[PDB]
Amino acid sequence: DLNDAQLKFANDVESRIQRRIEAILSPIVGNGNVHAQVTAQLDFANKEQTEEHYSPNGDASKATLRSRQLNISEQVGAGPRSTQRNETSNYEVDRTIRHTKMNVGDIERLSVAVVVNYKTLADGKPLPLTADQMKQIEDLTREAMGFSDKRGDTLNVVNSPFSA
Amino acid sequence: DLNDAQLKFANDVESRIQRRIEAILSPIVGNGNVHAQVTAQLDFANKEQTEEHYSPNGDASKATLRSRQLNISEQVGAGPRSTQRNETSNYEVDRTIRHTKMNVGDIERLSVAVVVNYKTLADGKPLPLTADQMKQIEDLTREAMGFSDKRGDTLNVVNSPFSA
Amino acid sequence: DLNDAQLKFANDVESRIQRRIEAILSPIVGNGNVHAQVTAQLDFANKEQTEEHYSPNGDASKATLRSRQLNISEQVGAGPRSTQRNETSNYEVDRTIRHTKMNVGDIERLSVAVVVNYKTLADGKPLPLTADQMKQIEDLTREAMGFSDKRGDTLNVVNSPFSA
Amino acid sequence: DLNDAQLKFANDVESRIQRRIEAILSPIVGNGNVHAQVTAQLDFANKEQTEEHYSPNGDASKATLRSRQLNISEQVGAGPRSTQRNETSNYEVDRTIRHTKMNVGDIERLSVAVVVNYKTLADGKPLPLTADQMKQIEDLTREAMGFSDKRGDTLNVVNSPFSA
Amino acid sequence: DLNDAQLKFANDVESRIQRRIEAILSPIVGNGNVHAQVTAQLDFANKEQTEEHYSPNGDASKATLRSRQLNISEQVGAGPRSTQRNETSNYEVDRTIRHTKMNVGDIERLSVAVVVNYKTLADGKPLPLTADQMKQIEDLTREAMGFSDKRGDTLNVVNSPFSA
């Protein structure tokens, strides 16, 4: 029931990422000379979070006060000195409440496998690509897939001649 | 259901960013001599936040007072001196409450992949572009995509001859 | 639903900024010899804010009083002196409450990409523009776009010959 | 909905400022020899403010009193002197409450771009204008646009020959 | 009843992972020259979790205070010294409540078995593959299956000639 809807959601996301990669990889490598497939680890767990933050007021310069009683006594007779300080302070503090409801269906970790073809010249020899072109393909695929390191995304692009 | 609506929202945003990039990249590079694709990491999490800020009043110059009782006693007989100061102060403080409801569907991180063609002169030789022109394309794409560093936007523009 | 309305709002704002830029850039550069595209980062977050400000009254010259009790005693017998001052003061303070509801749909950051053509004389040679003319175009575009530094606006105008 | 009404309001304000500038710039520069465009940053945020002001009464000359108790005692026996002064004062203070509801749709910052043509004499040579005439145009545009420094208004008028 | 639905859910997930692997393994190894099967250990246990986190306030620099009473007494007569410090502090602490409902049907551990064929040249000799090609197949399968180490995923790809 709901599981099938989630699976179809994942399939559509993967297909659209695949198409976005193919769109940029087509003009330079050529139609059919590139194949990519995407798998997506998604987030279907309902989470609700409330965050409370208090600004520190331990420093007297940023401390906000409402009432303060400072009783000071010094009975000098060091000799028979007698110092007494009774201090009472009531503070008002900065407060920030944030309520967050995470979206259901977010992407947790995306791994993408891309395979490119060789280059057959007018003679027909399948000449492999170069390192610079491979780096360009890797960068383009990283851009298309929305590659990020916080998610833990992995990308692998290899070059090999396609079968007949 | 709602996930499909969010996905269509993302697709429309990406398509419009793509079209905006293509619009400026067309007059100089030429029709079809430029291809770009956009992926968008969006924000579909409902967040509500209330912020409270208190202006500090620790300095006597900016401190606002309502009532103040200052009892001072000095019984000089340092000898048998006896100083006593009882101070009570009630303050009124500046207060700022901000209530914020973040919009659903905002952009978190935008990465854009752009590929340009080579230059075929009247002879037909695919002459590659220059560094200055590449920098101009990068700047134009950054302007079109709304490039920002707080979001974490990444842009990659590479030059390569298009396939037939 | 609402997201589409927000997107159409952004598109209309961007189109009108584009048209305003084109309107001034047309008479001097010429029809079609200028192309500009605008992207707008907008504010669709409902914010409500209440601000309270108290005027400081720590200086006796600007302090407003309602009731004041000053008991002073000096029993001179420094010898066996005995000074005692009990002071109680009730103040009235200036107060300013400001309630603000920010508009939904305001502009946060505007970045604009403008491209101009070269100058083809009667012979037909595409002569590039000059530095003074480029500075004039930059100033005119800044004026049209409502360029501001608090928002974080970025503008890029480059000169390049248009393709056929 | 409301955003479109606000945008149309901004467009009408900008168009009327443009027409006012054109009206004075026409008789001297000539019909069509002047083009101006206006952009307006407006205020669509509902603000409500209540201000309370108390006149200071720390000086005995401007202090208004309702009741005053002054107990003075001097038991001279400096010797065994004993001075005691108990003073209680109740004041009445001046008070001014101001309640302000700012208008929705006010102008925050106006920037205007104006371009003028060259002067083609009977021979047809496009003779540029002079510094005095440019200063006069700048002053007239500042007057028409309602130029102010508190708002942060910026004006740019440049001279360049119009294209065919 | 529900068990059959869960089993069909597992079968669909396994089939889609199998198809994703086959899709990338087809262009290089060839149609039919690759066979893969997937088994999935799934999560059909309903879990609900509430998390509470308190920011530490043991350091006086990050400690937020509401009321503080500090009575200090020093009766010097080390001699007959008498120090007494009574300190009472009330703190306000940061608080974060997270409520999480894990999705039913998540993947716990995925193990995948892939078998590839040999290479029969024009002569017909079944030449085995190379180490580099095997490593490429392993990497592609890891990318397709969403291989992760936290889950405990295991992958085994072996090379052997297919039977008639």
Residue numbers in the entry:
A (entry chain A), B (entry chain h), C (entry chain g), D (entry chain f), E (entry chain B): 229 to 305, 353 to 439
Provide the authors' original text about this structure:
The bacterial flagellar motor is a huge bidirectional rotary nanomachine that drives rotation of the flagellum for bacterial motility. The cytoplasmic C ring of the flagellar motor functions as the switch complex for the rotational direction switching from counterclockwise to clockwise. The basal body is made up of the LP ring, MS ring, C ring, rod and export apparatus. Here, we present two high-resolution cryo-electron microscopy structures of the C ring-containing flagellar basal body–hook complex from Salmonella Typhimurium, which are in the default counterclockwise state and in a constitutively active CheY mutant-induced clockwise state, respectively.
Given the high fragility of the C ring, we examined several reagents as the media of density gradient centrifugation in the purification of the intact C ring-containing basal body–hook complex in the default CCW state from our previously constructed ΔfliCD strain of S. Typhimurium, which lacks the flagellar filament, thus avoiding effects of the filaments on purification of the motor. The cryo-EM density map of the C ring-containing basal body–hook complex in the default CCW state was successfully determined to an overall resolution of 7.4 Å. Local refinements of the LP ring, MS ring, rod, hook and export apparatus generated their high-quality cryo-EM density maps at the resolutions ranging from 3.0 Å to 4.3 Å. Initial two-dimensional (2D) classification analyses of manually picked particles revealed that like the MS ring, the C ring adopts a 34-fold symmetric architecture. In the intact C ring-containing basal body–hook complexes, the MS ring is more stable and harbors much more clear densities for the outer RBM1 subring, outer RBM2 subring and putative inner RBM1 subring, which are made up of 11 RBM1, 11 RBM2 and 23 RBM1 domains of FliF, respectively. In the previously determined structure of the C ring-free basal body–hook complex, 5 L1 and 5 L2 loops, which consist of residues G311–P331 and residues P309–N324 of FliF, respectively, protrude from the β-collar region of the MS ring to bind the surface of the rod for torque transmission. In the intact C ring-containing basal body–hook complexes, there is one more peptide loop L3, which consists of the residues G310–P322 of FliF and is also extended from the β-collar region of the MS ring, bound in a hydrophobic groove that is formed by the α2–α3 linking loop of FliE6 with the D0 and DC domains of FlgC1 and FlgC6 on the surface of the rod. Thus, there are totally 11 FliF loops that extend from the MS ring to bind the rod in the basal body for torque transmission. These 11 loops are possibly derived from the FliF subunits in the 11-fold outer RBM1–RBM2 subrings. The more stable MS ring in the C ring-containing basal body–hook complexes indicates that the C ring is also important for the stability of the MS ring during motor assembly.
